[PDB]
Write a protein that binds this ligand. Structure first.
Ligand code: ADP
Ligand code: ADP
Ligand code: PAU
Ligand code: PAU
Lengths: 248, 248
């Protein structure tokens, strides 16, 4: 048959919920992660979204970078589906983990890499733009490590909150060489700057490890899609990894 | 004679206090800015630092990017010296301010541009690395605008506070192509990344305005100066701007 699987990607600000019956085509929703949220709250939020699909769920797979949120997901799964969720983490097998402490790498990154190696190949660089922006290097099926930078919103918010005079600027790329007002200055600095930062990190990787395909993902990737040379754009990469890790 | 002037640069985290008798050599001290600080508290902090030179101050010049602190600086000058401080502001004269609202550009950036045009030349690119990192464009003695990005610490701190899993990382350049643990990931993304972001903005400026000389300044510039191409390194640039603006 084609059993329905719930795939969860718990991020610091948002949690992605996706259902699939083949691990190839996904229906997805997004909810705020929500600090004090309960299993009943989560069921209540998902009820009018998933609809009838809710009772078809036979397996629950989760990548999570918010540990406090885990007992909530656990209780949701057990209460409403009488199953325990499968948790994405770094383990030996398809991917080699060539870093100092593999258990410390974010579950979202683990998922991204697993998705990459199953779908796209043994060699590549993954850029994931969310709350933080992440760079992950895969070489000959071995995860090599990467970079972590603040996300676009984290950056504009940090400038707003960390200074007296700066307003909160909307995230929008600059189409100019220099900003002519405060907002334009911050747009250029954060958005265009972050793209330069990413391209510079990528360039240096390529001179050591050679030319590798770049895959772009994340909720914040859309805004700057054309600004970074990439071979693949896949907004579903994390959810795909959760599927492959948990359900093959 | 050689009258002693006190120069003040009020930043969002730190305030710089400097004395000069010639506007060529500067003795300088640094304090936390301090939200609820009074004039007597400022005096008490400066007393053992300035010693007897305190009694010799004839003028007080101030660049400030924290409006609430201004009342305190004004009261300090009046109570202890019976003078009003001179405030750095964009005005017409030796610099043309070719931006939408000149009265909105930070007083420290104004001071930087005044110091540069007076001391270094008509054309240049100023990089001030502080709480936020600034890029300023000067063409034919005319201020053209710039970029604003979060500073190094602002970045590592925003990653720490904006995520569940990430620690507060020390600001130190990465000497590797990819980080092998969490701390190395953040260092590469933040410190090397921000250097790459600046090199891109600068490179793009130089495409339109030619090979302008680059000036480095700011408390955070030291750790990164061997990573950015620059013709001038001047940690006194803002304070020089305060002196030239106020005291000629
Ligand atoms: N305080 C906030 N106010 C408004 N929007 C926010 C805030 N914090 C984050 N966002 C939005 O959330 C998104 C970042 O989260 P997301 O891309 O889902 O990453 P993650 O999956 O890691 O949570 C951005 O699109 C940003 O605009
Ligand atoms: N919460 C904090 N804890 C420790 N150090 C901090 C904190 N916030 C800021 N700093 C320090 O202040 C520095 C920024 O201040 P500075 O370079 O003097 O710029 P400004 O002149 O704009 O205040 C950071 O690099 C950091 O080392
Ligand atoms: C970098 C984030 C915050 C991205 O969501 C996440 O991947 C994470 O919590 N990581 C743990 C640190 C690491 O990946 O090394
Ligand atoms: C960007 C900072 C915070 C740098 O210290 C400051 O110069 C400032 O408050 N500026 C006002 C914004 C502007 O210059 O357009």
């Amino acid at each position: 048959m084609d059993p329905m699987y719930l795939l969860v990607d718990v991020g610091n600000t948002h949690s992605v919920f996706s259902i699939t019956e083949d691990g190839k085509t996904f229906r997805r929703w997004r909810l705020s992660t929500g600090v004090f949220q309960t299993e009943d709250e989560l069921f209540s939020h998902l009820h009018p979204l998933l609809g009838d699909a809710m009772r078809e769920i036979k397996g629950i797979g989760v990548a999570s970078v918010v540990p406090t949120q885990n007992t909530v997901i656990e209780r949701f799964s057990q209460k409403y589906f009488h199953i325990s969720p499968i948790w994405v983490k770094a383990k030996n097998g398809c991917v080699k983990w060539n870093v100092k402490n593999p258990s410390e790498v974010g579950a979202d990154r683990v998922a991204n890499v697993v998705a990459f190696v199953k779908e796209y190949g043994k060699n590549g660089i993954i850029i994931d733009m969310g709350t933080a922006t992440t760079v992950d290097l895969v070489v000959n099926g071995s995860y090599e490590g990467g970079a972590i930078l603040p996300g676009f919103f984290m950056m504009v918010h940090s400038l707003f909150r960390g200074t007296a005079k700066l307003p909160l600027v909307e995230v929008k790329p600059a189409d100019f060489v220099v900003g002519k007002d405060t907002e334009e200055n911050i747009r250029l600095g954060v958005v265009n700057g972050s793209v330069y930062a990413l391209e510079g990190i990528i360039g240096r990787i390529k001179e050591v490890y050679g030319d590798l395909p770049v895959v772009l993902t994340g909720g914040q990737s859309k805004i700057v899609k054309d600004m970074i040379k990439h071979e693949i754009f896949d907004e579903d990469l994390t959810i795909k990894g959760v599927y492959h890790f948990c359900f093959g």
